[PDB]
Amino acid sequence: DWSRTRDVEDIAIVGVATRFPGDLNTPDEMWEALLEGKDCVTDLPEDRWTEFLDEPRIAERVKKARTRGGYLTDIKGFDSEFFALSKMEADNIDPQQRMALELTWEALEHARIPASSLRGESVGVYIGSSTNDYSFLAMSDAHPYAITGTASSIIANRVSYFYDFRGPSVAVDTACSSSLVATHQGVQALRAGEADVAIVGGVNALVTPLVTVGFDEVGGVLAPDGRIKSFSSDADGYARSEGGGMLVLKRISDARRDGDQILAVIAGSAVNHDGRSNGLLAPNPDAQAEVLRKAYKDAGINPRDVDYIEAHGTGTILGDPIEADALGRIVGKGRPADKPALLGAVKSNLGHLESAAGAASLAKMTLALANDKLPPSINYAGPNPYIDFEKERLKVNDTVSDWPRYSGKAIAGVSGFGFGGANAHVVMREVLAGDLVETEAAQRLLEQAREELEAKEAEEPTKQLVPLAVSAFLTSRKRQAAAELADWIDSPEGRASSLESIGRSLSRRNHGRSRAVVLAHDHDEAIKGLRALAEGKQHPSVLSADGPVTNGPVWVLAGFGAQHRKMGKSLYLRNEVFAEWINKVDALIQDERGYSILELILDDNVDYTDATCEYPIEVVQLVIFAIQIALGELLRHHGAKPAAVVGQSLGEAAASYFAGGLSLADATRTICSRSHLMGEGEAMLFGEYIRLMALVEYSADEIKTVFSDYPDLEVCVYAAPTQTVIGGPPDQVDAIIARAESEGKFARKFQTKGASHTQQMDPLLGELAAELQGIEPKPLTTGYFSTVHEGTFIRPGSAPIHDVDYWKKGLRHSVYFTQGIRNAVDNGHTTFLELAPNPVALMQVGLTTASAGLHDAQLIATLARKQDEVESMISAMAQLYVHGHDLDFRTLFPRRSKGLAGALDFANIPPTRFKRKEHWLPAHF
Amino acid sequence: DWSRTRDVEDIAIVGVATRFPGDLNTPDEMWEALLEGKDCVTDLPEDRWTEFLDEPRIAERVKKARTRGGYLTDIKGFDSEFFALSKMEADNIDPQQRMALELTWEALEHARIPASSLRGESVGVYIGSSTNDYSFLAMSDAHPYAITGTASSIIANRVSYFYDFRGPSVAVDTACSSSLVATHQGVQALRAGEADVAIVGGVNALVTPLVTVGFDEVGGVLAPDGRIKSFSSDADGYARSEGGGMLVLKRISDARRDGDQILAVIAGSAVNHDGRSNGLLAPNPDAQAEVLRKAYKDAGINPRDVDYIEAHGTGTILGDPIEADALGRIVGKGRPADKPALLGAVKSNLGHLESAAGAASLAKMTLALANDKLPPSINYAGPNPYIDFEKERLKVNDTVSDWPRYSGKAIAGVSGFGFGGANAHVVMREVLAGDLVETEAAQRLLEQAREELEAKEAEEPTKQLVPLAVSAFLTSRKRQAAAELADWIDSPEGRASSLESIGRSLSRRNHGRSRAVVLAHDHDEAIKGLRALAEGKQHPSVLSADGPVTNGPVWVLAGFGAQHRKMGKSLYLRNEVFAEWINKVDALIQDERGYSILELILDDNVDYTDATCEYPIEVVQLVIFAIQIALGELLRHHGAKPAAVVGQSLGEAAASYFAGGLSLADATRTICSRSHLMGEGEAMLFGEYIRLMALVEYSADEIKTVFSDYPDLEVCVYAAPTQTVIGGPPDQVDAIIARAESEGKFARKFQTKGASHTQQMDPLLGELAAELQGIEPKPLTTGYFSTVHEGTFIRPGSAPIHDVDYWKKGLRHSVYFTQGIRNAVDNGHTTFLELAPNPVALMQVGLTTASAGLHDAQLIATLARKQDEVESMISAMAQLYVHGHDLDFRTLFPRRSKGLAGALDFANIPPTRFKRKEHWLPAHF
């Protein structure tokens, strides 16, 4: 009978913003006032309308009028610096635009949706306004800036400009029901694409008495006392008020997917017109009946099941019976005498907000549905004698009461009728639960580690590290927030939080250009770091910056001499993404070589030297290669992406995969063949043709002059401008070591039996090439710095370069690591990230950057020896976040209890604070 | 690739209204101007802005400005009487509202959709406005009426009030692209229900120089000469203009169903925002590319197939290259160098209509698509050096040219970008052909009649009667239109019309309260009648009235003594609905009695007396009963519906079917059994028990006093207050005839062997009741006047009353025909319609109405003897239409060539004329 004809989604409400009379600037303040039954109407403030006063003719006319209603405590204040506006431009801005910008920010903050994440997205803005009062002050004389400020279209266009919204931006105007119409258009859009999020609301302002005087001149419209008595025997008119409100709307499927908290659900809505009634301003009950029937038909809900109606409630002796009649025809039809539809109006509390009444009504029901209480309707001294509630199945709820839930759930209706004839109705219902629902030995070692780990935790439970993010568009604002946050944490409410809720809440706040992160294990550490961050004092557990870096990060894949007894073990057990990719690489290696690496990573006795019989030279490279892949994909899972990559003789395979030149399977083949061939080749020869490598503190120019006396020696790696790795027979290297010592130059030996990038590789090329057949190089798609091609930068989209000859050249010939780093600095890159079990290449990079004139380079280190594998990747992510690099900070705080225990999560941290300064347009008249 | 993801309909355009500069008040004037390349820009009129002038400070500031653009010749004029507005209220009405009311009327008139037919329907109004200039004049001092007049919401709400629209009524505001946005919302609504017709457009007005001065103060915005040079090397700004336009939109399926002419088709549309660009007023090419891609994706059209683009064309040196760039990215991508997308802008002809540019652009393309020509773009002195048209696959069409039709059809795009960032695009295509597509002897006699009819037509072809309808809200306006229409008919253009096109066009005009109809066979007769109607002179071929009657018509089903040789024959051959229902009744009678009546109707020799062996008393009733059913259903087919019904001893069966008490089959059984039983019963007895009936000029009171001496006599029918039909033995009736003659009272005998409503029926009741078993009386659903229950009115929805005992009582007891008529007059009924082959009961009704004090009763007569069966039902329909009764006058002019020869139909009759009087708000400053 009343089911949907069209298959459409239900819209979800995730945010609310309030700027209503009575200092109701937040939903929490609004909810308390409604329960207490607060009358927010008050006399005209002494400082309002002063521009028109001082003229005896208009002044006495104003006094004769009523001039009593809801007025904002502060309307002139405005934080122009926050919204990037000049004083001259700000002074010529209608307060309607100011409210929209402020309300939009609060709504997203209330919805815990970072405003930065919505930049460039398809977000629609639908706002209702009717009166351009502010434009009258400008024309009293003026500046051209008043054209944009006082325009109605700019009310929404400006919002979509500051927040960078790429969706529809229109300002509707249906008089007293504009807010509901704007909500209707947003709901219809989301059901028909065209957007993913929608900001819907309305705004009004009483800047001049022209409209108020006009209504008083008509007579019988304004109440003498300024109080509304919706559905009462003492109705005598209404009073005009100012304010605004906003809502955030998303498809219920998206809200469930994204983890957003759902406060209420909009099942459907409808709008129509009264047509030819007994005058333009005379309501027509017949049309009101149709829109109610039209709305509930779309919502797929039988009106007999409704529990509460937020009526228009204009306190008119003649217009109230008409509204009740229509409700009885549709809503109050067939109901038992003991199941009336509760009735109420918010205008009794706040007044008649012309273009914002719908927003106030929607907010009231949204909070009521999110909670489980129905606030009363004040100013009810008895039923209207001209309305038969018993016959119409209605009841005016003038006391705090709970939802009857006739149908088992909560359903509400919001109705708003304009004075020109336009009508609208919105159907709302509570959120339901249904809306929240759509290798043998390796196992043996794995079980032992988990049992040992669990047993050790019982003796000493470790305290999890929590990164607390603080950000703002200015450093001064950033540190002010930290001090406010620290004070709240020290308060009993803060002490009663898990310290993971606080991080989760902060991760969902706007991530500005000036960013800071605090690494705290408990509340006390967080307070100390935040207090230090309140000023410029440094702190080991505090990361801070003043602005983002120009260019993206560079990933370094060296993976040489960075192995120890237990690497990749702790993070494998305590992380899933890292373990997942480790297994995938293990399976590929098992297919190729026939053995698993997990038997080595999980085993503790193995130290990769004399503990593994199967060519320790081979396994070491494979384990490092697997770790590099897992770390890179882990960073990708959190949103990180590399602008450029570079490797040093061992990470070329990993670098290719990250860039995109080769697939994971193809890259695994290259490293496996390279590693196995080197291991067997080194064991094949011993004593006769053995050649070892050593490190020498020499430059490229010095190497050419000194290699003349030593013909057989070759250059292997250009680690640093003043350092180089060379290989050759022990006698030649021994002489070089003695020669360098004679000149005071530091040198080493690396104590490594293996030797790559020398003549030993020559026999291996023939068989190496055959094994590598079948690989399919692809376009890079990412910046590259080939150490084998003389450190020449390669742009994304270039032709494939990872052919077989590429790997043979790298294995045999030297690698220009230092040259590539210098070229990257020339292009402007300043942040370098190393993926390895132990950072050893950062020192080499630091020397190159300093030699190139860069001394404040960002050297980020992944897993390091003798440090917890966790709490080191978290720090690496924080540094990327601080310096403006790509990172989804919300991924570090996954939700455990979605829809079950939301109270303990999402702590009540302080909100963003604005510095409001007077901005008004002088006038004399 | 570009096909639709969602299954949605294509929207059709059926009407256009224009109020653009250059006296372009009609599409025909607009189309001619575009072809001629007319520059509608002109200097400021001397009579404009005089209120602000006379002040030296503002006056010299205005002169220093440009003050050159498109201005309306007459803006103050307004026909308040037509729209029911007082002088005080009209003076405080913004011209934007006035244009919307006028444009809406013209659009429906252009679309040939009666505005009266849309009253109470789900019609949406979406109108774009940005500046409330008129409100500044009111506040210079004022009246409260300025609140409604100058409000933006009332621009659309007032339209939906005057025309009684029950759909959405909202006023959008997106600055310079509001008109396109309004069109977008209407298109989306129609695809998602919520409405059946949509009025979309925009309006602007230049009442004050405040906005013009502001732009001049900025500098670099307004052109010094006021001329726009869209896409030219001499672009130096633009000029502001005023005007408005409207369109009528319907789902293409509905337009095809209703016969509406389709001018163009809207495949799809889209809107978005520029986001954070280089300033609020700086356009963003990236967003423009997305909306074009977004729009064509919805339209299911590949952009490479577009043939013409109606660009924004603001004549800005910096904004024009940006628009071209986006077009090249999407539209001009992959095109051959010899297939460019033609480019043009209407702003060059009219100027920059802020909130009405989209309406002007849509109208231009709509006329171009309806025709087969592309108008040029004026002010093109060479391509812009900063735009590479060859590389972007674009061409500025500066000459009259035909559609290239790259894809085989015509496709166009309209783009409008606001100064705040909002953007929109609409895709249009021409209307295609595919869019316009989804009883033996009786036959022998039927063929003879058709051949004889066709043969007779050749000797003398009959001239078809055409009812010409003229109507208006006042008699004076009605007769003024007739004189204008008559003059046009006498003109060569009128003489070149079929005279059926003229009627068809008039049938689709608004049907007001004051209505008139002219029955003309040729043009000369129509002119003579219209000229007579121009004044109060009467004319036999002219039907006129000053206002509708209060209550609905009453249908009278007597069908006694109204048979002749050839009844229902001429209309059966020349009408389909009448023939259809005749056959259905014939089949039912064939099942019951076993013979067909068509053998009698079609036969000419039969005269229903001595020519039919099968009980002429029986066949006569059946033939009359069949005719009554056919006429009633024929009237229903044209929209007529009865408020009440009444019958006289023979139409009770037909009256029951029309009311709804009984089904057609059940009613047929009652008459068949009644007729057959009477025929056999009368033949059963002869001489001994034969009793005949006679008419006597006596009243009911006189009958009671006179029946004392004659015991056996009975009253049969109370035909009139002073007349009565009685039955009895011939001796008793003979004495009554002599007695009446002795007193001078007229009497007759009826020369009828049969006699009903007497003792002869008593034996027939027993068998009559058995035959009638199984009938299922139902609720009436219509007013009834039972002549068997003492003429007591019965309201609709009453319990069934047509049980078996009801028919036995009527057949045996008298019928109170006069009493029922008097009761109907008491209830207020004044129009009586008789369904019978020959009107005989009207005389009886006329006497009763006069006796009750009603002398101007509307007595409408159906088919009459010795008159053409056609041209008599047409007159009956005209009288119902004239007196305000329900009738779809469009059904009398069916379309023959839909989409084939539309030129010869839908003549170019004069349009509605308004009397405009000055209505302006004085101001001093």
UniProtKB/TrEMBL annotation, chains A, B:
Q: Give the E.C. number(s).
A: 2.3.1.94
Recall the GO molecular function terms of this protein's record.
Answer: erythronolide synthase activity; fatty acid synthase activity; phosphopantetheine binding
Which keywords describe this protein according to UniProt?
A: Acyltransferase, Fatty acid metabolism, Lipid metabolism, Multifunctional enzyme, Phosphopantetheine, Phosphoprotein, Transferase
Keyword Lipoprotein among UniProt keywords: no
Looking at the record's lineage, which domain of life comes first? Bacteria
Task: Give Gene Ontology CC terms.
Answer: cytoplasm; plasma membrane
Q: Where is the Ketosynthase family 3 (KS3) domain?
A: 8-430
Biological process terms from the Gene Ontology for this record are: DIM/DIP cell wall layer assembly; fatty acid biosynthetic process
Annotated residues that bind (R)-4'-phosphopantetheine are located at A370
User: This protein is called what?
Assistant: Polyketide synthase PKS13
